[PDB]
């Protein structure tokens, strides 16, 4: 169908054949991220490659060892269950990011690594992801790291530049500023990615439980497992996938 | 009363405007009561009162309520029938009923000036001061445009030892989270004491407010005897009842 | 022309509304000439043009000038009698003669929307593009009042691949410094290209503007031959003589 | 040979019980306050009480005036003073943000540099008579600087300059200010007296000619002069501070 077109276009523009094999599976990432709308999936593919060549410091190296320290510290875990809509749910925790040891680029890379791992799941291509950022422990040094360059790339990676549907961004324990940072974007923003950005603040337990019943760690309201558990499980996973993360590295 | 005879002299010797507010004992006592009969502080307070009055004629000269009656009618302002448990008088201001395409920040300030002028006659109010509740539900970009740096100063100035009323509490409810950032920037410029008297309750104000004002708030805010519409109407009638006294103290 | 036949085909396949603009050979060209005859890019624009037309009915539906005639009469907007050294059409907007008490942002928008549709007809203006000048002297808080976020996105979208005209220059003069503050934050969310084509000459413009548009500016900005007055009458005479054609392309 | 208000000021200082140390209450000292207020006894006394009030509220700024803790900042080229006075006898002080590394130095360290310099120049009768003008070159201004200027620092800055230091502020000139500073300035303008508002100058990126009017013939090459560089006057001032390090100890606690 539109897969027949996509491949042809890919040949024509001389889309880099490496490191990712241009398989049918890989092309359906783009098709699925755009509900099989050919123009749109192709525009995304182009933006994907465009973003990678602009950012070799981020895109070229997906090998996890360089950031093993950050995984071990407890920055990042992925829930064992999908949410009610088939989304994968990812958790990032600022407290467990030493801004002295890891730069914003190192932290970004974590997400890139996780994204590349979860994009292979057909269910995840279909139902996208939801990212939770627990901002407790937010410092001034974290902010320092978030430059215009970095802000811009955070945007693109959710602005038609990576084959994943962002179904929701949840922030908990954000400092007051984030709301100012955000009151000045709410009405500036589209209607689309505005029903998907949730600032829960300090009093987050109840609203978090409404979006993600029966599947959250004890820290955020659940009762089956802890953040430390899912951090280790996702880290074990990421390491069990280091050969694959090399195969798709420059 | 301690210092009334001294203040009487100072007032003459300094040549304080004898009109429009006539220098009755009851008038000079406001200043004494406002500073717990400490003559010096009272005298400093009275000089500040006049200094502000002369630097903001566009605010102090005219206390005739008719210009702002539309605003009162719209349900912007009311005063609770009861005093709080420490004798304070309690004023309620509702932002949602200030239509900033029809009334400026000056019109709104003038409403607080009218109300303050009327309540300071109550000895109990002079003794136990005042508390103001600001309901910021419905706050607009358009309200903010009216709060110029120039208006911010005049607000601050009247509150800085320049009106004969003890400020016992400022309560915000339903404030936009921005109000917290602005607060952080202001805090170091404020005394310890006044900081302890500013409360930002948020959208979940109901139970934290009920601790400061049990039994007296209107139904909208957790009370159960009367409505905001009633106290607005009551206070509106009262301002207009006083329209002549207000004109008599107007330049 | 390379892709002239091809484009119509895609339009016929998508069934793009037959009217109010008839899908003539001349009307399609605009989108090709806008994207240097790039078949894929011409299309995207044309999709986004109709896409933007349906999102903002209250802007794109009516292009009848007579609603804004008084705004034109006031002398808000003018266009140079000559093209620039690159063939761009130069457009001037003077905020001073926009009365936010009489005309809204949607109204002032409509003026630009009318001028644009007229000048895009001209082959050369398609090819070389357009430069805007915003004489922001006389800027008031009641003007920013009208530039809502709801309007800011509608403004930005118009310039964001949603109209068949080449933005070749945005010049701002007599900016209230706060315009530099707003521009700081739009920088990251801007491509390198149009960033260069944006100029903030400030209070000192005469020299910086002269090197961009010599021989062809009006006296107010360092010309000689005519005045803003003249070209506001002429450009007003032109939009009014077009009122018939403007009606045909309305709904 | 009697200075107006001097003998009275001494007695006011005695009735109040003003701290004898670290700064001895010599006539030379009292005169700072008198001259700062054109020999108006009352206002010089208000001023002197304010100086002492602000010192107690900011001991982390006021106690240590020893130069060695901020020597690194001076070596870096942050601060200089012009050899010449301007045409009305003011000492002219130049501060350069670009040479301030906020990783190494806090706003308090920076603030202390001004306090040292101010304490040295106040000893000059001419500077007591004709005040100071200060040029802040904000080229290089970073987010990391911004974050050092908390509301608390903003207040302490405000307070020092509000009737609390015996130096006449005769001009504040900013060059290469980010646009933000104009917004901030618009917000505080109502809070400022007319006389001070007319003494604040934001010159921008194109400062060259505008600054040349206030300070002809006397500026460094970097700002349109011709006789010396900023590097020269930074080093000359560093050395001067360091040769004053003994006096600076004697006015510390
Ligand atoms: C650089 C300028 C800043 C900006 O624009 O931000 C918007 C950005 C991007 O939003 P979007 O990429 O347009 O959102 C996608 C979004 O990424 C994608 O997931 C959506 O698919 P789906 O969730 O509806 O299945 C998809 O739906 P449509 O193509 O409109 O049908 C879009 O809504 O959203 C970001 O998540 C917010 C971070 C600031
Ligand atoms: C941006 C500049 C702000 C500033 O400079 O503070 C000025 C003003 C200060 O209000 P005050 O006049 O100091 O408050 C009086 C306050 O008005 C008065 O009621 C207090 O007496 P009492 O309530 O305890 O009897 C009285 O206590 P003391 O006489 O100082 O012991 C004071 O707290 O505070 C205002 O509430 C500003 C709020 C935005
Ligand atoms: C909410 C999103 C806001 C946004 O980002 O839009 C900004 C827009 C972006 O620039 P552009 O309108 O996409 O620029 C076009 C531009 O519209 C078009 O005229 C240009 O053609 P030409 O003038 O170079 O021949 C064309 O050149 P290229 O095809 O890229 O080589 C493009 O650069 O530039 C605006 O004109 C700036 C106004 C603030
Ligand atoms: C957020 C609130 C900020 C604020 O209020 O600060 C006011 C402060 C007070 O300036 P001052 O200490 O009064 O200034 C002196 C000023 O220090 C002194 O030089 C002036 O004397 P002279 O130089 O003209 O002889 C003297 O003249 P007057 O005797 O008071 O008329 C004053 O202008 O001025 C500061 O320099 C702040 C500048 C940004
Ligand atoms: C494909 C993909 C990537 C690559 C991704 C995310 C998502 C949902 C994706 O689908 C979420 C996070 C992000 C954009 C990287 C975040 C990196 C920074 C350094 C984290 C630290 C601090 C943030 C300022 C905290 C809040 C950010 C949210 C508003 C996104 O990485
Ligand atoms: C004697 C007296 C006056 C005269 C007075 C008040 C009080 C408590 C008094 O005792 C409180 C209000 C104020 C200062 C007038 C404020 C008028 C403004 C324009 C209201 C609109 C919006 C404000 C952003 C609401 C928040 C107010 C607090 C931050 C003070 O007038
Ligand atoms: C096709 C087209 C349109 C339709 C257009 C413009 C250009 C260059 C076009 O090519 C420029 C002006 C604009 C966006 C009209 C703006 C409407 C408002 C009400 C103007 C008033 C004030 C603005 C706050 C000025 C800022 C915008 C400039 C920086 C461009 O309409
Ligand atoms: C006696 C005295 C002191 C003590 C003084 C100054 C002057 C003129 C004095 O006479 C000027 C500077 C100041 C207030 C210290 C400022 C320290 C800050 C941390 C500098 C860095 C950045 C500021 C954002 C620069 C702009 C400030 C000006 C608008 C004053 O210290």
Swiss-Prot record, chain A:
Annotated PROSITE patterns: CRAL_TRIO (PS50191)
Organism: Mus musculus
Signal peptide: none
Transcription regulation keyword on record: no
Membrane-crossing segments per the record: none
Predominant subcellular localization, coarse grouping: cytoplasm
Result of changing residue 34 to W: Abolishes binding to phosphatidylinositol 3,4-bisphosphate and phosphatidylinositol 4,5-bisphosphate
Gene assigned in the entry: Ttpa
Cellular-component GO terms for this entry: cytoplasm
Effect of residue 196 to W: Loss of tocopherol secretion (in vivo). No effect on tocopherol binding and intermembrane transfer (in vitro)
Sorted UniProt keywords: Cytoplasm, Lipid-binding, Transport
Name of this protein: Alpha-tocopherol transfer protein
Chain residues that bind a 1,2-diacyl-sn-glycero-3-phospho-(1D-myo-inositol-3,4-bisphosphate): 160, 165-167, 192, 196
Binding site for a 1,2-diacyl-sn-glycero-3-phospho-(1D-myo-inositol-4,5-bisphosphate): 183-186
